[model samples]
Target: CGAASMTKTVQARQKLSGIVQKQNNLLRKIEAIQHLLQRGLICGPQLLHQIAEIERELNNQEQEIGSLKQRAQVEKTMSAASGCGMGPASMTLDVQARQLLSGIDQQQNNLKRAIEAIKHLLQLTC
Candidate 1:
């Protein structure tokens, strides 16, 4: 029984770890998207759709984590907890996501400024 419990604990920890890793990867993708936006490297509505998809995935992941936390709490209450302890990992993921979102917002502001500048220049040339 002890060995089985240990194995279950390890598996739970591994699953949580995988989720955390996936969250980090999504955060990196968000940063890459922001970089593309800032550099004006994306063209057309397709790029916007790609960004939107990433954002949607991120949101889904966040909701999943929340659900996981609630499930973990219930398991702990029932003495079925596996000791994976996702709090820190979840918090870290939240921070990374926030930072990426902030970067994207800044890049969008830059894009607006660049567009305004181009318009002014065009007016001057005309």
Candidate 2:
């Protein structure tokens, strides 16, 4: 029973870690897109499409993290009930996931600001 619980906790942690990594990757892509827009390397529908894709990815990641958090909470609660000593590890994972989620949110906001700036530039050009 103990081994099974340990395995479950490890699996959950791994899944959350993967999500964090993907979120980081998405953030990098967002930054690249912003740079391209700033320098006029890309614009119009192409730029808009890139930004929209990034936003979609960000939203998906946020949802994934939310789901993982709920699972982690449930696992922690079960561990506590079973006296399995997994609460601290679960809590740590939750904190890291939340931190990554927050970072993604900030990136999303930055992207939104970039979109507004681009729109303004388009207006001026026209």
Candidate 3:
């Protein structure tokens, strides 16, 4: 039971670790947009507002990611201390991992759109 619980916890941690990495990556991308904005490379107020909004969202998500990591650690510790069942553990990770993947896909699309917008703005008047 201990070994099985340990395995589940390890898997859960790995899945969540991926999310943490991506969350950091997303924050970096948001910060980069600020550089473009600061350089006067972007368009008018709309883009500035949009970038600001995205940054706000990123900040919120970073907090959420921190919470998720904490939760994972808590669960991992609990499972290690007490012999928990493995069935539900793997199932929960599958659901969360799928949701995270879905979100990452949408974020990738958003990044694509943002880049296109920035390039278009650079082509036009700022």
Candidate 4:
């Protein structure tokens, strides 16, 4: 036939029963982080407090993180002057430092949206 029916009739099915139950099996604690990270992305209420706290803590750390970079440079220069000779470590430090600072800044910006999301979810739920 050129065209088939919209609904197909089920020809066969199986029940969920077969073997006897026995309790001698071993179990392992396999873990996954993907689901944890993806929990209710569009839903916001459950994580509002955590979101706020994380952002707040990160915001607090911003000052300390900034000072780290400043102090690193100051100390690096002094080390160089004293014949310690900044080399690969200095470059790595700068790269890693800037990456952390940038990541924190972006996450701090995300807090604003998370707060708005919580407000919207609250509006819907309340």
- RMSD to the hidden true structure, all candidates: 10.1, 4.5, 9.7, 24.4
Among these predictions, the greatest TM-score belongs to 2
- Residue 20 local lDDT, model 3: 57
lDDT of 2 by residue, 1-126 (tens): 232346665676687567657766765776675566577644357666666676677667667766766765776777777777673454535465556556655655665565556556655643
Off by over 4 Å in 2: 1-4, 76-126
Model 2: pairs clashing at backbone N, Cα or C within 3 Å: none
What's the distance in Å from true for residue 30, model 1? 1.3
Q: What is the per-residue lDDT of model 3 for residues 40-71, given as tens digits with 9 covering 90 to 100?
A: 65556756666656656655655655565466
Candidate 3 stretches with Cα past 4 Å from truth are 1-42, 85-91, 95-126
Ranking by TM-score: 2, 1, 3, 4
Give all candidates' CA lDDT scores. 0.50, 0.61, 0.58, 0.40
Off by over 4 Å in 4: 1-55, 90-105, 112-126
Clashing pairs in 3: none
Write down the lDDT that model 2 would get. Answer: 0.61
As a whole number from 0 to 100, the lDDT of residue 11 in candidate 4 is: 11
Better of 3 and 4 by TM-score: 3
Question: Is candidate 1 or 2 superior in TM-score?
Answer: 2
What RMSD does model 2 have? Answer: 4.5
Summed backbone clashes in each candidate are 0, 0, 0, 0
